[PDB]
mmCIF file of C-alpha atoms in Angstrom:
data_model
loop_
_atom_site.group_PDB
_atom_site.id
_atom_site.type_symbol
_atom_site.label_atom_id
_atom_site.label_comp_id
_atom_site.label_asym_id
_atom_site.label_seq_id
_atom_site.Cartn_x
_atom_site.Cartn_y
_atom_site.Cartn_z
ATOM 1 C CA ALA A 1 60.857 83.907 81.515
ATOM 2 C CA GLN A 2 62.949 82.563 78.644
ATOM 3 C CA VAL A 3 66.642 82.184 79.442
ATOM 4 C CA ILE A 4 68.885 85.139 78.675
ATOM 5 C CA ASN A 5 72.516 83.982 78.593
ATOM 6 C CA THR A 6 74.324 85.685 75.701
ATOM 7 C CA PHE A 7 76.885 88.505 76.062
ATOM 8 C CA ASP A 8 74.601 91.186 74.680
ATOM 9 C CA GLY A 9 71.488 89.904 76.354
ATOM 10 C CA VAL A 10 73.023 89.808 79.831
ATOM 11 C CA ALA A 11 75.046 92.984 79.201
ATOM 12 C CA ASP A 12 71.917 94.953 78.281
ATOM 13 C CA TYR A 13 69.903 93.410 81.142
ATOM 14 C CA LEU A 14 72.598 94.386 83.680
ATOM 15 C CA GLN A 15 72.808 97.999 82.511
ATOM 16 C CA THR A 16 69.066 98.541 82.237
ATOM 17 C CA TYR A 17 67.743 96.778 85.332
ATOM 18 C CA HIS A 18 70.944 96.620 87.403
ATOM 19 C CA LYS A 19 70.591 92.907 88.146
ATOM 20 C CA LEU A 20 71.298 89.648 86.274
ATOM 21 C CA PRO A 21 68.393 88.014 84.390
ATOM 22 C CA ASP A 22 66.449 85.412 86.406
ATOM 23 C CA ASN A 23 68.245 82.252 85.111
ATOM 24 C CA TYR A 24 71.388 82.857 87.217
ATOM 25 C CA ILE A 25 72.344 81.270 90.541
ATOM 26 C CA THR A 26 75.510 81.697 92.644
ATOM 27 C CA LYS A 27 77.893 78.832 93.341
ATOM 28 C CA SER A 28 76.553 78.541 96.915
ATOM 29 C CA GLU A 29 72.898 78.496 95.869
ATOM 30 C CA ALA A 30 73.744 75.827 93.284
ATOM 31 C CA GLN A 31 75.552 73.782 95.936
ATOM 32 C CA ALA A 32 72.489 73.960 98.244
ATOM 33 C CA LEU A 33 70.348 72.587 95.398
ATOM 34 C CA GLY A 34 72.772 69.652 94.911
ATOM 35 C CA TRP A 35 75.277 70.977 92.386
ATOM 36 C CA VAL A 36 78.490 68.970 92.236
ATOM 37 C CA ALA A 37 80.913 70.728 89.882
ATOM 38 C CA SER A 38 82.874 67.570 88.999
ATOM 39 C CA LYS A 39 79.604 65.737 88.157
ATOM 40 C CA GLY A 40 78.476 68.592 85.865
ATOM 41 C CA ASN A 41 74.877 68.195 87.047
ATOM 42 C CA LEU A 42 73.849 71.867 87.266
ATOM 43 C CA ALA A 43 70.956 71.521 84.768
ATOM 44 C CA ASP A 44 69.735 68.368 86.606
ATOM 45 C CA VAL A 45 69.430 70.128 89.985
ATOM 46 C CA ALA A 46 68.671 73.666 88.669
ATOM 47 C CA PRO A 47 67.010 73.419 85.264
ATOM 48 C CA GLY A 48 67.588 76.392 82.949
ATOM 49 C CA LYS A 49 69.970 78.033 85.435
ATOM 50 C CA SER A 50 73.561 79.144 84.996
ATOM 51 C CA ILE A 51 76.273 79.955 87.544
ATOM 52 C CA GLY A 52 76.437 83.789 87.890
ATOM 53 C CA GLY A 53 76.456 86.518 90.590
ATOM 54 C CA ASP A 54 79.493 85.727 92.710
ATOM 55 C CA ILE A 55 82.173 88.323 93.508
ATOM 56 C CA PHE A 56 84.999 88.441 90.950
ATOM 57 C CA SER A 57 88.266 89.240 92.700
ATOM 58 C CA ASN A 58 90.107 90.285 89.510
ATOM 59 C CA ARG A 59 93.188 88.436 90.722
ATOM 60 C CA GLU A 60 95.375 89.215 87.735
ATOM 61 C CA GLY A 61 94.307 92.890 88.019
ATOM 62 C CA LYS A 62 93.317 93.001 84.324
ATOM 63 C CA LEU A 63 90.013 94.848 84.865
ATOM 64 C CA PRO A 64 90.201 98.494 85.900
ATOM 65 C CA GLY A 65 90.229 99.011 89.674
ATOM 66 C CA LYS A 66 88.803 101.958 91.632
ATOM 67 C CA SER A 67 88.289 102.634 95.375
ATOM 68 C CA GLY A 68 84.702 101.528 95.952
ATOM 69 C CA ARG A 69 84.523 99.312 92.876
ATOM 70 C CA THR A 70 83.854 95.581 93.296
ATOM 71 C CA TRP A 71 83.292 93.173 90.391
ATOM 72 C CA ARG A 72 81.059 90.146 89.847
ATOM 73 C CA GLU A 73 81.096 87.427 87.119
ATOM 74 C CA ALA A 74 78.523 85.164 85.425
ATOM 75 C CA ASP A 75 78.742 82.267 82.945
ATOM 76 C CA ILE A 76 77.722 82.953 79.341
ATOM 77 C CA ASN A 77 76.645 80.456 76.650
ATOM 78 C CA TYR A 78 76.007 77.785 79.253
ATOM 79 C CA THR A 79 73.194 75.263 78.896
ATOM 80 C CA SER A 80 74.099 71.929 80.536
ATOM 81 C CA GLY A 81 77.036 69.709 81.442
ATOM 82 C CA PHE A 82 80.525 70.882 82.391
ATOM 83 C CA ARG A 83 81.102 74.645 82.459
ATOM 84 C CA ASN A 84 82.680 76.486 79.538
ATOM 85 C CA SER A 85 85.207 79.306 79.281
ATOM 86 C CA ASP A 86 82.885 82.240 78.560
ATOM 87 C CA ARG A 87 82.133 84.742 81.320
ATOM 88 C CA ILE A 88 80.616 88.198 81.663
ATOM 89 C CA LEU A 89 82.242 90.562 84.149
ATOM 90 C CA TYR A 90 80.357 93.522 85.642
ATOM 91 C CA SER A 91 81.286 96.121 88.271
ATOM 92 C CA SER A 92 79.398 97.947 91.015
ATOM 93 C CA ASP A 93 79.338 101.109 88.820
ATOM 94 C CA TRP A 94 78.110 99.056 85.814
ATOM 95 C CA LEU A 95 81.246 98.650 83.699
ATOM 96 C CA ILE A 96 80.890 95.472 81.581
ATOM 97 C CA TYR A 97 83.562 93.198 80.206
ATOM 98 C CA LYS A 98 83.730 89.670 78.822
ATOM 99 C CA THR A 99 86.192 86.883 78.377
ATOM 100 C CA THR A 100 85.999 83.886 76.070
ATOM 101 C CA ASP A 101 89.365 82.347 76.885
ATOM 102 C CA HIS A 102 89.034 81.540 80.579
ATOM 103 C CA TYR A 103 90.116 84.889 81.923
ATOM 104 C CA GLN A 104 93.384 85.127 79.891
ATOM 105 C CA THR A 105 92.050 88.202 78.070
ATOM 106 C CA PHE A 106 89.116 90.532 78.503
ATOM 107 C CA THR A 107 87.191 92.837 76.158
ATOM 108 C CA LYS A 108 85.250 95.899 77.369
ATOM 109 C CA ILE A 109 81.679 95.600 76.041
ATOM 110 C CA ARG A 110 79.862 98.416 77.881
ATOM 111 C CA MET B 1 89.113 61.940 96.975
ATOM 112 C CA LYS B 2 91.486 63.669 94.537
ATOM 113 C CA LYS B 3 95.207 63.919 95.226
ATOM 114 C CA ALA B 4 97.512 66.437 93.576
ATOM 115 C CA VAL B 5 101.329 66.597 93.945
ATOM 116 C CA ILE B 6 103.730 69.420 92.964
ATOM 117 C CA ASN B 7 107.441 68.468 92.957
ATOM 118 C CA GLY B 8 108.614 72.063 93.489
ATOM 119 C CA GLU B 9 112.201 71.352 92.505
ATOM 120 C CA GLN B 10 110.895 70.590 88.989
ATOM 121 C CA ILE B 11 109.028 73.891 88.653
ATOM 122 C CA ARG B 12 111.089 76.123 86.349
ATOM 123 C CA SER B 13 108.523 78.806 85.410
ATOM 124 C CA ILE B 14 104.929 79.815 86.237
ATOM 125 C CA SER B 15 103.928 78.036 83.032
ATOM 126 C CA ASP B 16 105.255 74.757 84.531
ATOM 127 C CA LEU B 17 103.306 75.405 87.703
ATOM 128 C CA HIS B 18 100.010 76.034 85.923
ATOM 129 C CA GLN B 19 100.584 73.109 83.568
ATOM 130 C CA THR B 20 101.414 70.856 86.521
ATOM 131 C CA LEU B 21 98.167 72.023 88.162
ATOM 132 C CA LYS B 22 96.177 71.361 84.955
ATOM 133 C CA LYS B 23 97.245 67.679 84.961
ATOM 134 C CA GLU B 24 97.105 67.070 88.723
ATOM 135 C CA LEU B 25 93.618 68.616 89.230
ATOM 136 C CA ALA B 26 92.199 67.279 85.951
ATOM 137 C CA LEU B 27 91.444 70.852 84.747
ATOM 138 C CA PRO B 28 89.619 71.745 81.510
ATOM 139 C CA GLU B 29 91.610 71.800 78.229
ATOM 140 C CA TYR B 30 90.644 75.521 78.093
ATOM 141 C CA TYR B 31 92.316 76.133 81.497
ATOM 142 C CA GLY B 32 93.446 79.751 81.299
ATOM 143 C CA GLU B 33 96.660 79.282 83.326
ATOM 144 C CA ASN B 34 96.022 82.370 85.431
ATOM 145 C CA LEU B 35 94.953 83.265 88.936
ATOM 146 C CA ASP B 36 91.335 83.954 87.911
ATOM 147 C CA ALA B 37 91.278 80.648 85.930
ATOM 148 C CA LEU B 38 92.479 78.720 88.959
ATOM 149 C CA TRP B 39 89.924 80.242 91.359
ATOM 150 C CA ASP B 40 87.140 79.388 88.932
ATOM 151 C CA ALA B 41 88.483 75.840 88.520
ATOM 152 C CA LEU B 42 88.827 75.458 92.278
ATOM 153 C CA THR B 43 85.279 76.667 92.924
ATOM 154 C CA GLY B 44 83.390 75.464 89.817
ATOM 155 C CA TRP B 45 85.230 72.445 88.308
ATOM 156 C CA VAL B 46 87.514 70.479 90.639
ATOM 157 C CA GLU B 47 86.369 67.285 92.327
ATOM 158 C CA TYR B 48 86.571 67.283 96.153
ATOM 159 C CA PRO B 49 87.788 66.251 98.617
ATOM 160 C CA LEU B 50 91.137 67.527 97.414
ATOM 161 C CA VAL B 51 94.537 66.982 98.919
ATOM 162 C CA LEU B 52 97.292 69.173 97.534
ATOM 163 C CA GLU B 53 100.812 68.171 98.448
ATOM 164 C CA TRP B 54 103.253 70.912 97.502
ATOM 165 C CA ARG B 55 106.825 69.687 98.057
ATOM 166 C CA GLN B 56 109.948 71.880 97.894
ATOM 167 C CA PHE B 57 107.831 75.046 98.112
ATOM 168 C CA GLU B 58 110.928 77.292 98.471
ATOM 169 C CA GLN B 59 112.567 75.953 95.320
ATOM 170 C CA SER B 60 109.307 76.463 93.307
ATOM 171 C CA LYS B 61 109.392 80.156 94.311
ATOM 172 C CA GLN B 62 112.767 80.696 92.595
ATOM 173 C CA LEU B 63 111.674 80.665 88.975
ATOM 174 C CA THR B 64 108.001 81.584 89.414
ATOM 175 C CA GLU B 65 108.753 85.071 90.730
ATOM 176 C CA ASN B 66 105.691 85.861 92.861
ATOM 177 C CA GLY B 67 103.665 83.079 91.312
ATOM 178 C CA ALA B 68 104.188 80.278 93.848
ATOM 179 C CA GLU B 69 102.838 82.456 96.686
ATOM 180 C CA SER B 70 100.010 83.856 94.555
ATOM 181 C CA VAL B 71 98.877 80.362 93.553
ATOM 182 C CA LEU B 72 99.070 79.100 97.116
ATOM 183 C CA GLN B 73 96.957 82.059 98.245
ATOM 184 C CA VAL B 74 94.235 81.145 95.708
ATOM 185 C CA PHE B 75 93.943 77.649 97.165
ATOM 186 C CA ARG B 76 93.895 79.093 100.703
ATOM 187 C CA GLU B 77 91.038 81.460 99.810
ATOM 188 C CA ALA B 78 89.184 78.651 98.059
ATOM 189 C CA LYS B 79 89.617 76.694 101.309
ATOM 190 C CA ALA B 80 88.469 79.698 103.342
ATOM 191 C CA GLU B 81 85.452 79.878 100.964
ATOM 192 C CA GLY B 82 84.320 76.372 102.015
ATOM 193 C CA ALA B 83 86.129 74.201 99.459
ATOM 194 C CA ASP B 84 87.263 70.898 100.947
ATOM 195 C CA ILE B 85 90.953 71.319 100.315
ATOM 196 C CA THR B 86 93.805 69.929 102.404
ATOM 197 C CA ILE B 87 97.169 71.641 101.771
ATOM 198 C CA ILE B 88 100.472 70.017 102.633
ATOM 199 C CA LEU B 89 103.540 72.183 102.372
ATOM 200 C CA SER B 90 106.958 70.493 102.458
#
């Protein structure tokens, strides 16, 4: 299908279907296809894919924690080249946040 | 591959530490200077192999509060995650 990689688009897809849209691949998957972060070759080895799906450890504790809740993150607005600073953050109980300033600040969007 | 050095005796805040890291690891200009920003840089930006030499660790803990240990921990987890990171603590 066509790539879905905008805040609303992914946000709505995660709530509705409880999974990321099909254009996302984890860091490990990307690495097994030949991704080399420093080269910025993700679209060469995985055309139309974006990094998304890995566990988000919420290291600064800015997102709300709960026993049982784990978070995950995925890149937003990415097409090719070096990665940007936009991410979408989503929890096991479907809370959805974003960040556009490389995890300095977060806004609750669902 | 890439070599980074932290002269811990020159670290006077957690801002210094993050800004030293931004230069030494060739991080993005948008680098968020936070623990989440560093993990993401370590696992989706940084060129490897990576050798981090952190000198005067104890002194760098004085004005970074809990920051020196937190940052260190992020590199160790990154290394536990498979990243090719060598850490040298002096």
